[PDB]
Structures are given as structure tokens and as C-alpha cells.
Amino acid sequence: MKRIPRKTKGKSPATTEPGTSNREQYKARPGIASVQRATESAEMPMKNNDEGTPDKKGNTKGD
Amino acid sequence: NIHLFKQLLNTETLSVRGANPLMFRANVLHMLLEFVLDNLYLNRHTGFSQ
Numbered sequence: 585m586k587r588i589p590r591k592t593k594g595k596s597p598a599t600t601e602p603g604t605s606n607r608e609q610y611k612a613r614p615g616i617a618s619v620q621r622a623t624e625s626a627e628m629p630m631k632n633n634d635e636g637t638p639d640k641k642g643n644t645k646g647d
Numbered sequence: 648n649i650h651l652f653k654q655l656l657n658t659e660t661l662s663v664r665g666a667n668p669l670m671f672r673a674n675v676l677h678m679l680l681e682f683v684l685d686n687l688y689l690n691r692h693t694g695f696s697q
Contacts, residue, residue: 609662 659676 635646652674653666660667
């Protein structure tokens with residue numbers, strides 16, 4: 585058994601392989617950080633538009 | 648002698664020991680141009696001795 589918390593309120597021998605050496609000299613172009621920053625803002629879903637719809641009590645909420 | 652083939656367009660070459668192969672022709676062309684330009688001289692007569 586495992587526990588997963590909710591996110592919203594509810595009803596309540598030698599081993600050194602001859603190729604694993606790290607000799608990196610490549611700089612990404614465009615850089616990883618910049619495009620990652622942009623696409624992270626791209627990930628966000630569009631905002632909710634709740635205005636004009638009723639609530640659990642039955643009164644429409646908004647202005 | 649790598650540095651003589653990376654002085655035209657190797658601006659993105661991070662490594663100091665490396666060079667981009669795809670600009671070899673351009674670098675060689677510039678090298679040949681300098682080779683020609685550096686030799687534009689007239690041979691002078693100095694003097695002799697038996």
C-alpha cells in the first residue's frame with residue numbers, strides 16, 4: 585500500500601567502461617536555459633472564466 | 648597547428664583545441680590570400696664578391 589496526497593479539498597573485475605569519460609565542449613545554440621524558460625511559460629493552461637455561472641447555493645457569481 | 652584553420656567563422660567553437668570542419672575551405676582561401684599578399688615584393692640587387 586502507498587499514500588498519494590490530494591491537491592484539492594474534497595467532501596470532507598574492472599568496471600570503467602571505455603566510453604563513459606566526460607569530455608564535453610559543446611555549448612547549445614540556442615541555449616537550453618533560454619528555450620526552457622520560454623516553453624515553461626508556454627506550458628501554462630489558459631485561465632478559468634467562472635464569471636456568470638451559478639454556485640452551489642444557486643446564485644450567479646461575478647459582478 | 649589547428650588555430651590557423653579557425654580564424655574566420657569559428658566564433659561558436661567553445662573549445663580552444665577544436666575547429667569547425669565546415670569552414671575549412673573558407674579558412675584555407677583566406678590563408679592563400681594572405682600567402683599571396685605577403686610576397687608582393689621586388690627583388691633587390693645588393694652586391695657580390697669573388
